[PDB]
Write a protein that binds this ligand. Structure first.
Ligand SMILES: [Zn+2]
Ligand SMILES: [Zn+2]
Ligand SMILES: [Zn+2]
Ligand SMILES: [Zn+2]
Ligand SMILES: [Zn+2]
Ligand SMILES: [Zn+2]
Lengths: 446, 446
């Protein structure tokens, strides 16, 4: 099963045939990529808000228009999928989803309302792909650059009526029925601690400083509860590197930041008439990203090393979280850097898959976002910025869908790409809930 | 070779599994869709400005979020392709392309500057896929809802340094070197006349009222030159229907409007804070579309009947032109109606292909556009409108990338789907110039 080794423009883009990405007919290669044999493992990579527009701008900047992302662009079976949510009250489609409703969609197979995690419009809990893979005996991993209580990773292990029910204090007032003192399953963090995935890595240390208001570990911080429950706590790249085993008896929990892990590149925020008024921007590496802070490609490599020891197989969800945050912030360099960062993790995932032979790799996003690539001389109503690209040319990016402080998500259908046994199930048009079923069946969970 | 018969949400979208579009594993279906046998014919369908956002908005409105377009969404091999142009002066990538440079890309296989038609950055002509198909003996058709001098169809038969060189008067001043009086190949219209495709249908009658300034048919209108050269002039549905043969000896030319043919649906234009201030819009059929004016689906069906008489095979380009115009106009209803209109033609195309068996069908767009699907309560800086969808819910559309009168194109990569011999070549990441080589080889033109 081939991986697209190189789809970069093959020559001089100004000459006939120079911009071509193919060098020959693909039928045979595509035939060699179809396989319905079972999947022993599944690695799902999610770019938060990484729609086709985000992928194209990132590619233009970092690799040039005719460039190729060795990770993101290498998956050979591609398609487009819909990710609309539901109105809680009416049950009708809500065309633009938040991150919680979409995450719940691919993780349980049921559409839901914006802000909901692991429940339906009736607020009924539904098993997640993670809980099921675990029940079946497979190893499970949940890695992300966001705080672990954010929607994308929270959706694999918590079922709360509202995404804001981070820890005890927010839950008591936002999710009274999920609150431990009120007899419910608990806040997002407490639920994460009960779900016990073998590997969980990300930020969000802050909430672990809260104290249970009821239950066995009442009055102890959730950090104390974790240690007390047998979790291997780790907080830097070195200690993370030390880890040699991770399992149900010795579950690993890496908290690498109080909130979201640091962003990879720095740049100014887009502004009104920024491409006209201000000069072009060249992104700069964030000197605070640190070598004591593991990178997403590092977190992924470790998770795969550890989870692969399980003879039974594994399920791993990896997330490039800050792409969505930076898009909301109208900051091109931060947005693009997190896309580059995500590509590195995709490469470490394909390398394993390629060798292993029974791994389904999937790369996609939860919903589309605000940014659009527009002409250099555009005079737009919103925020824009000109960037000096790898090609030595100027690219102008525009965020114009909100007057509020945050740019908004958008409803367009977007790319889904896969590699391995059962990747055929992402080709053509599909729905995000379909991804739950594809994964459920590829793994043969019943 | 299967066509996706139904990818609509399978049931109650509020229940588990109800929003699924798949009913089973697709590996076997995808295997039956791969063929490298030669293509006898090729039907290329272009949605001008039809990016994934345009397709999604149109589906939500006309079919509902869980709907399915029987034409547009039924192609089983899909992918994404890049369509960046080149800076004439520098040779560097220009991230946002106009319709001239993109059209030249798939029709000649060479990247070029915005505004160019059938020439490279050096202003050198290059043969078009149509000129080649013709030289090879295949029948050729060029259909569109735009004026025939517009970029998308102009590109198959003209080579001018600027797309504005419609007829004699414009050429003399905009393209002195292409000017007939100055010894060049002639204006877009004159060149169309010389190209002599078997079937050419669309609008743009206005320019044929000009008179050559030189050459054999000097001082005659281009209309007179057409009749004099043996073209079958037709201008309404009925006369179009009467046509029983179309060939090199009796080439057919249908001019159904002075400019662009009429748009299918009417609605007001988006406005500032339109979704907040104004009530929701329900699109209304244009009572001037007329039954004497053949629809795109009809123009397509006729073109297929006539061109299929050629034992050798044929090449046909079909274009839903007004999607792009309505998007520039910030008119949701117009933009959506031409996408539905395009779907009708795609169905006519798949039906023929499905029975015939040696036909490569490709549906894609030249570039992405401005429109985005945003939350109902969005407070945006540009133009917005709320529409009442088929789901009985409200969808808000937003155009926010220009302060000028026209909304601008965008650079995002977009969908490309195919069906038939050689469709594998559109899967994964490709470039618009690759579509020229795919068609060239599928037809075996050398
Ligand atoms: Zn999100
Ligand atoms: Zn997220
Ligand atoms: Zn977001
Ligand atoms: Zn166009
Ligand atoms: Zn056009
Ligand atoms: Zn346009």
């Amino acid at each position: 099963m081939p991986v697209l080794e190189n789809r970069a423009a093959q020559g001089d883009i100004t000459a006939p045939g120079g911009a071509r990405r193919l060098t020959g007919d693909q039928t045979a290669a595509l035939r060699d990529s179809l396989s319905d044999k079972p999947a022993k493992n599944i690695i799902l990579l999610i770019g938060d808000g990484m729609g086709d527009s985000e992928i194209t701008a990132a590619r233009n900047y970092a690799e040039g228009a005719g460039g190729f992302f060795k990770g993101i662009d290498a998956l050979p079976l591609t398609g487009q999928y819909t990710h609309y949510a539901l109105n809680k009250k009416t049950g009708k489609p809500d065309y633009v989803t938040d991150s919680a409703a979409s995450a719940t969609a691919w993780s349980t197979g049921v559409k839901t309302y914006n802000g909901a995690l692991g429940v339906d419009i009736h607020e009924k809990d539904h098993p997640t792909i993670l809980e099921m893979a675990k029940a079946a005996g497979l190893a499970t991993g949940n890695v992300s650059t966001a705080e672990l209580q954010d929607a994308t990773p929270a959706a694999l292990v918590a079922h709360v009526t509202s995404r804001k029910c981070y820890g005890p204090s927010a839950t008591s007032e936002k999710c009274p029925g999920n609150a431990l003192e009120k007899g419910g399953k608990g806040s997002i963090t407490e639920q994460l601690l009960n779900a016990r995935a073998d590997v969980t890595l990300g930020g969000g240390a802050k909430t672990f400083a809260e104290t249970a208001t009821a239950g066995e570990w009442q009055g102890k911080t959730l950090r104390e509860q974790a240690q007390a429950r047998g979790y291997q706590l780790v907080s830097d790249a070195a200690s993370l590197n030390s880890v040699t085993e991770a399992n149900q008896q010795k579950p690993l929990l890496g908290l690498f930041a109080d909130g979201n892990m640091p962003v990879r590149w720095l740049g100014p925020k887009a502004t009104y008439h920024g491409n006209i008024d201000k000069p072009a921007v060249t992104c700069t590496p964030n000197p605070q990203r640190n070598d004591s802070v593991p990178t997403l490609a590092q977190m992924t490599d470790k998770a795969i090393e550890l989870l692969s020891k399980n003879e039974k197989g594994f399920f791993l969800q990896v997330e490039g979280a800050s792409i969505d945050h930076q898009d909301h912030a109208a900051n091109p360099c931060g947005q693009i850097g997190e896309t580059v960062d995500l590509d590195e993790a995709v490469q470490r995932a394909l390398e394993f898959a390629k060798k292993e032979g029974n791994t389904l790799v999937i790369v996609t996003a939860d919903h589309a976002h605000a940014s659009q690539i527009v002409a250099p001389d555009t005079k737009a109503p919103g925020l824009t910025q000109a960037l000096n690209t790898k090609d030595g040319a100027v690219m102008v990016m525009s965020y114009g869908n909100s007057e509020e402080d945050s740019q908004e998500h958008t409803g367009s259908q977007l790319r889904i790409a896969a590699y391995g046994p059962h990747a055929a199930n992402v080709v053509g048009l599909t729905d995000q809930t379909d991804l739950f079923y594809t994964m459920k069946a590829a793994l043969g969970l019943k």
